[PDB]
Scaffold this active site. Structure first.
Site, PDB file in Angstrom:
ATOM      1  N   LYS B  45       6.809  -1.975  -4.712  1.00  0.00           N
ATOM      2  CA  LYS B  45       7.288  -2.600  -5.950  1.00  0.00           C
ATOM      3  C   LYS B  45       8.603  -1.962  -6.422  1.00  0.00           C
ATOM      4  O   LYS B  45       9.285  -2.554  -7.256  1.00  0.00           O
ATOM      5  CB  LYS B  45       6.215  -2.519  -7.054  1.00  0.00           C
ATOM      6  CG  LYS B  45       4.979  -3.384  -6.784  1.00  0.00           C
ATOM      7  CD  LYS B  45       3.937  -3.245  -7.879  1.00  0.00           C
ATOM      8  N   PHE B  86       7.149  10.235   1.369  1.00  0.00           N
ATOM      9  CA  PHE B  86       6.755  11.507   1.974  1.00  0.00           C
ATOM     10  C   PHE B  86       5.293  11.824   1.598  1.00  0.00           C
ATOM     11  O   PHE B  86       4.470  12.035   2.497  1.00  0.00           O
ATOM     12  CB  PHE B  86       7.722  12.653   1.543  1.00  0.00           C
ATOM     13  CG  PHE B  86       7.138  14.056   1.487  1.00  0.00           C
ATOM     14  CD1 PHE B  86       6.743  14.713   2.651  1.00  0.00           C
ATOM     15  CD2 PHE B  86       7.045  14.741   0.280  1.00  0.00           C
ATOM     16  CE1 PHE B  86       6.231  16.020   2.602  1.00  0.00           C
ATOM     17  CE2 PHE B  86       6.524  16.040   0.227  1.00  0.00           C
ATOM     18  CZ  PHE B  86       6.114  16.669   1.387  1.00  0.00           C
ATOM     19  N   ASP B  91      -0.618  11.738   2.445  1.00  0.00           N
ATOM     20  CA  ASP B  91      -1.854  11.453   1.695  1.00  0.00           C
ATOM     21  C   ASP B  91      -2.768  10.470   2.462  1.00  0.00           C
ATOM     22  O   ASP B  91      -3.983  10.659   2.453  1.00  0.00           O
ATOM     23  CB  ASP B  91      -1.529  10.901   0.298  1.00  0.00           C
ATOM     24  CG  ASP B  91      -2.755  10.491  -0.498  1.00  0.00           C
ATOM     25  OD1 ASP B  91      -3.388  11.384  -1.117  1.00  0.00           O
ATOM     26  OD2 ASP B  91      -3.072   9.276  -0.511  1.00  0.00           O
ATOM     27  N   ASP B  95      -6.547  11.396   3.338  1.00  0.00           N
ATOM     28  CA  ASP B  95      -7.610  10.574   2.739  1.00  0.00           C
ATOM     29  C   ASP B  95      -8.244   9.618   3.764  1.00  0.00           C
ATOM     30  O   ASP B  95      -9.136   8.850   3.398  1.00  0.00           O
ATOM     31  CB  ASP B  95      -7.055   9.802   1.519  1.00  0.00           C
ATOM     32  CG  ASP B  95      -6.615  10.756   0.416  1.00  0.00           C
ATOM     33  OD1 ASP B  95      -6.942  11.944   0.505  1.00  0.00           O
ATOM     34  OD2 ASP B  95      -5.947  10.296  -0.548  1.00  0.00           O
ATOM     35  N   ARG B 100      -1.801   0.418   3.653  1.00  0.00           N
ATOM     36  CA  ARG B 100      -0.873   0.790   2.583  1.00  0.00           C
ATOM     37  C   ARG B 100       0.186  -0.292   2.537  1.00  0.00           C
ATOM     38  O   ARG B 100       0.736  -0.651   3.582  1.00  0.00           O
ATOM     39  CB  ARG B 100      -0.285   2.201   2.872  1.00  0.00           C
ATOM     40  CG  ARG B 100       0.907   2.707   2.003  1.00  0.00           C
ATOM     41  CD  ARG B 100       0.540   3.261   0.641  1.00  0.00           C
ATOM     42  NE  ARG B 100      -0.279   4.484   0.693  1.00  0.00           N
ATOM     43  CZ  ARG B 100      -0.931   4.989  -0.356  1.00  0.00           C
ATOM     44  NH1 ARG B 100      -0.831   4.414  -1.553  1.00  0.00           N
ATOM     45  NH2 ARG B 100      -1.666   6.076  -0.224  1.00  0.00           N
ATOM     46  N   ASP B 162      -7.047  18.017  -5.775  1.00  0.00           N
ATOM     47  CA  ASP B 162      -7.710  16.778  -5.367  1.00  0.00           C
ATOM     48  C   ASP B 162      -8.577  17.031  -4.092  1.00  0.00           C
ATOM     49  O   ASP B 162      -9.731  16.585  -4.021  1.00  0.00           O
ATOM     50  CB  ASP B 162      -6.638  15.695  -5.112  1.00  0.00           C
ATOM     51  CG  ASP B 162      -7.152  14.411  -4.486  1.00  0.00           C
ATOM     52  OD1 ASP B 162      -7.426  14.414  -3.261  1.00  0.00           O
ATOM     53  OD2 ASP B 162      -7.165  13.382  -5.182  1.00  0.00           O
ATOM     54  N   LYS B 188      -1.043  15.796  -9.618  1.00  0.00           N
ATOM     55  CA  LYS B 188      -0.885  14.959  -8.427  1.00  0.00           C
ATOM     56  C   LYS B 188      -0.133  13.632  -8.658  1.00  0.00           C
ATOM     57  O   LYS B 188       0.405  13.095  -7.683  1.00  0.00           O
ATOM     58  CB  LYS B 188      -2.235  14.697  -7.704  1.00  0.00           C
ATOM     59  CG  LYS B 188      -3.177  13.648  -8.316  1.00  0.00           C
ATOM     60  CD  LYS B 188      -4.137  13.109  -7.239  1.00  0.00           C
ATOM     61  CE  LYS B 188      -4.984  11.957  -7.725  1.00  0.00           C
ATOM     62  NZ  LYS B 188      -5.766  11.297  -6.645  1.00  0.00           N
ATOM     63  N   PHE B 227      -1.746   5.687 -15.348  1.00  0.00           N
ATOM     64  CA  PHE B 227      -1.465   5.065 -14.062  1.00  0.00           C
ATOM     65  C   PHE B 227      -2.423   5.558 -12.962  1.00  0.00           C
ATOM     66  O   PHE B 227      -2.859   4.750 -12.142  1.00  0.00           O
ATOM     67  CB  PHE B 227      -0.009   5.307 -13.650  1.00  0.00           C
ATOM     68  CG  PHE B 227       0.462   4.385 -12.548  1.00  0.00           C
ATOM     69  CD1 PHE B 227       0.856   3.080 -12.831  1.00  0.00           C
ATOM     70  CD2 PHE B 227       0.473   4.808 -11.224  1.00  0.00           C
ATOM     71  CE1 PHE B 227       1.278   2.221 -11.808  1.00  0.00           C
ATOM     72  CE2 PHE B 227       0.894   3.945 -10.201  1.00  0.00           C
ATOM     73  CZ  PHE B 227       1.303   2.661 -10.504  1.00  0.00           C
ATOM     74  N   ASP B 231      -5.232   3.567 -10.983  1.00  0.00           N
ATOM     75  CA  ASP B 231      -5.276   3.672  -9.520  1.00  0.00           C
ATOM     76  C   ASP B 231      -6.720   3.909  -9.027  1.00  0.00           C
ATOM     77  O   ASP B 231      -7.132   3.291  -8.050  1.00  0.00           O
ATOM     78  CB  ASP B 231      -4.349   4.786  -9.011  1.00  0.00           C
ATOM     79  CG  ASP B 231      -4.253   4.820  -7.494  1.00  0.00           C
ATOM     80  OD1 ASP B 231      -3.695   3.864  -6.914  1.00  0.00           O
ATOM     81  OD2 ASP B 231      -4.795   5.767  -6.889  1.00  0.00           O
ATOM     82  N   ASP B 232      -7.489   4.761  -9.733  1.00  0.00           N
ATOM     83  CA  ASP B 232      -8.889   5.078  -9.437  1.00  0.00           C
ATOM     84  C   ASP B 232      -9.787   3.861  -9.661  1.00  0.00           C
ATOM     85  O   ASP B 232     -10.661   3.574  -8.830  1.00  0.00           O
ATOM     86  CB  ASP B 232      -9.348   6.265 -10.290  1.00  0.00           C
ATOM     87  CG  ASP B 232      -8.725   7.589  -9.887  1.00  0.00           C
ATOM     88  OD1 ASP B 232      -7.936   7.611  -8.913  1.00  0.00           O
ATOM     89  OD2 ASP B 232      -9.034   8.602 -10.526  1.00  0.00           O
TER      90      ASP B 232
HETATM   91  O1  ZOL Z   1      -5.875   8.057  -4.876  1.00  0.00           O
HETATM   92  P1  ZOL Z   1      -4.598   8.890  -4.373  1.00  0.00           P
HETATM   93  O2  ZOL Z   1      -4.501  10.134  -5.371  1.00  0.00           O
HETATM   94  O3  ZOL Z   1      -4.861   9.421  -2.973  1.00  0.00           O
HETATM   95  C1  ZOL Z   1      -3.110   7.780  -4.324  1.00  0.00           C
HETATM   96  O4  ZOL Z   1      -2.790   7.420  -5.611  1.00  0.00           O
HETATM   97  C2  ZOL Z   1      -1.948   8.515  -3.683  1.00  0.00           C
HETATM   98  N1  ZOL Z   1      -1.447   9.733  -4.337  1.00  0.00           N
HETATM   99  C3  ZOL Z   1      -1.286  10.940  -3.738  1.00  0.00           C
HETATM  100  C4  ZOL Z   1      -0.772  11.824  -4.713  1.00  0.00           C
HETATM  101  N2  ZOL Z   1      -0.642  11.101  -5.865  1.00  0.00           N
HETATM  102  C5  ZOL Z   1      -1.030   9.836  -5.631  1.00  0.00           C
HETATM  103  P2  ZOL Z   1      -3.424   6.280  -3.310  1.00  0.00           P
HETATM  104  O5  ZOL Z   1      -4.607   5.536  -3.931  1.00  0.00           O
HETATM  105  O6  ZOL Z   1      -2.204   5.423  -3.111  1.00  0.00           O
HETATM  106  O7  ZOL Z   1      -3.821   6.697  -1.853  1.00  0.00           O
HETATM  107 MG    MG Z   2      -4.861   8.358  -1.106  1.00  0.00          MG
HETATM  108 MG    MG Z   3      -5.093  11.312  -2.117  1.00  0.00          MG
HETATM  109 MG    MG Z   4      -6.109   6.070  -5.168  1.00  0.00          MG
END
Ligand code: ZOL
Ligand code: MG
Ligand code: MG
Ligand code: MG
Ligand code: ZOL
Ligand code: MG
Ligand code: MG
Ligand code: MG
Lengths: 338, 338
Positions: B45, B86, B91, B95, B100, B162, B188, B227, B231-232
């Site tokens: 975006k 990066f 990540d 994870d 993506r 995390d 994070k 934000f 995301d969660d």
């Molecule tokens: O849930 P995350 O923290 O891993 C994530 O937000 C990525 N991220 C990593 C560090 N800050 C954000 P994404 O859901 O895109 O995989």
């Molecule tokens: Mg992630």
């Molecule tokens: Mg992560």
């Molecule tokens: Mg996430």
């Protein structure tokens, strides 16, 4: 008697760790950082970091070598050790290595795994953290930041070239040329290993001239190339109880100095033995490649190369050391060619 | 009509790629860098990068907004996109993510694998390469370098927290507290996502005051927390055709806002269902956790939280925006809370 200069440098690591580990919310992350630092930046020879300290003392007037200036020199020396630690933690993952400095690779540790990617990134972050905490008010502050960033980029380009020339499970013997080999080692090892610590001491001594850094690079880049060639030789012929690490170059299909020299001497039959046995995990196939190298007298070829390289580097010191003290490069040449 | 400001920013990516890909020996590594850049910094975006450009235009006098100053603003905007690229490449590996931005994760690509660790490092290196090529002679040069380095360190501490709170195959429900959750998201996501692009435009506009950056942080850190919470929520309840990525939080045993809210509302029986089903790869167990969240009205709890957060952030804008134009933060609040 040079073990004393090392002992002092090692003793300062406790201060580096304390300063980097000093917010109750980040406590667990700070404890993980301390574990990463202790596991990875300790167990080595500290030659790269020590080169900062040794060259600082040889380039700065003793009257300007006060307690705080010396502290800044030890810190930048530890910054070089941290850059190396960052690259080796990630390199052990990408090369599927088992041991490093006589212990299992950090990523191979139960409970670490691919979290080591972030651990490696934290080690890199610690460099700029120490540069800000100790050298922020120094006229060479930006010079050092740019030097560590440029050294990182050159190493990462070298790593890219190393990984591209070594695809897993793909016969890339035709790509294993001398020109290709020289390009890889120039970027992946030579810049951060010898130019970085000397250039850092130079910037700290007020020696920022383009020509002085260019001349220093002429000697140190050739020293770096030798060190990587020796690293390739030791990957297979070195004693793991001395090197602290188990070799993976043959299994990893790497463009090693050994395979390049093999291809310059191999008959069409020897070439086919290499083709059918290189880049594979089987112990029997790795053994066949080692037998081929021993048949082609590559250990004697390396010994001869080491002598020619030493003589070439000493000739470069005579040509390019001035106006710096020759001892700056001689001390480094003695440690590497021992 | 805001799609035009985006279109212009996107058009400048071709220049960024050309400048970063311009030595025949490094040619293959340069071609790999171009592939990494094209795959990872495109398909998004570009809101974080665009925020640099938009805030630059809103903070700098139009008479000082010349062609070269605007070029520097687009470049620093792309530097923010590169920092994000990066962190996301690394990540996705840590994870164990699959997709993506509507395509398979770069490390999941056949022939890439763990070489993505070095690819991620190269993306980080490109930031400082662009800062040197475009902002070296600018009074804010060191301010920007330090801002990107500090943002990286904070994100990496957040990533450490995390990964520590989410050990693979270990029931860590007791560790999933609100205090723990706030600490993770602060480091994070909040710093690099909103403070970084605005602070960059501020330094570029000559706004370097400690108090001005402190006040801006008060608004942007709270926007960052929202934000990450969103995301969660979207990890499990979002449409993957809109988010572009498949959720992994439940399988990865993450300290998600969802699991924290679950534990604040769960009965002892619901707690045991969560304990026996959380942090595991089985589709049946993930489904049971989602059913538990839906039973505990967590989507309605999130909707209420989003409204309370929006109102809180707008109150912070009223308190702390001055002397900056409120539009700087309002434009960002409209995009995030849409
Ligand atoms: O849930 P995350 O923290 O891993 C994530 O937000 C990525 N991220 C990593 C560090 N800050 C954000 P994404 O859901 O895109 O995989
Ligand atoms: Mg992630
Ligand atoms: Mg992560
Ligand atoms: Mg996430
Ligand atoms: O052989 P590599 O290039 O991988 C090595 O020298 C590490 N390295 C990585 C970049 N430069 C050097 P090591 O043998 O320690 O595993
Ligand atoms: Mg290696
Ligand atoms: Mg390697
Ligand atoms: Mg090696």
């Amino acid at each position: 008697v040079y073990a004393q200069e090392k002992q002092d440098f090692v003793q300062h690591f406790s201060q580096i760790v304390r300063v980097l580990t000093e917010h109750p919310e980040i406590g667990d992350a700070i404890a993980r950082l301390k574990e990463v630092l202790e596991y990875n930046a300790i167990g080595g020879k500290y030659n790269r970091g020590l080169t900062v300290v040794v060259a600082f003392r040889e380039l700065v007037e003793p009257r300007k070598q006060d307690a705080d200036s010396l502290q800044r020199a030890w810190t930048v020396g530890w910054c070089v050790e941290l850059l190396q630690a960052f690259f080796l933690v990630a390199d052990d993952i990408m090369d599927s290595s088992l041991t490093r400095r006589g212990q299992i690779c950090w990523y191979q540790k139960p409970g670490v795994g691919l979290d080591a990617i972030n651990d490696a990134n934290l080690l890199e972050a610690c460099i700029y953290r120490l540069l800000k905490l100790y050298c922020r008010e120094q006229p060479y502050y930006l010079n050092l930041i740019e030097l560590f960033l440029q050294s990182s980029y050159q190493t990462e380009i070298g790593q890219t070239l190393d990984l591209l020339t070594a695809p897993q499970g793909n016969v890339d013997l035709v790509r294993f040329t001398e020109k290709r080999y020289k390009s890889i080692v120039k970027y992946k090892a030579a810049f951060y290993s010898f130019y970085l610590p000397i250039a850092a001491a130079m910037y700290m001594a007020g020696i920022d001239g383009e020509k002085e850094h260019a001349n220093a690079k002429k000697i140190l880049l050739e020293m770096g190339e030798f060190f990587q060639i020796q690293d390739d030789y030791l990957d297979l012929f070195g004693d793991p109880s001395v090197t602290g690490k188990i070799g993976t170059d043959i299994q990893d299909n790497k463009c090693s100095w050994l395979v390049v020299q093999c291809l310059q001497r191999a008959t069409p039959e020897q070439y086919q033995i290499l083709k059918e046995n290189y880049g594979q995990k089987e112990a029997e196939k790795v053994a066949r490649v080692k037998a081929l190298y021993e048949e082609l007298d590559l250990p004697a070829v390396f010994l001869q190369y080491e002598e020619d390289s030493y003589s070439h580097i000493m000739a470069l010191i005579e040509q390019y050391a001035a106006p710096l003290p020759p001892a700056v490069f001689l001390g480094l040449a003695r440690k590497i060619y021992k």
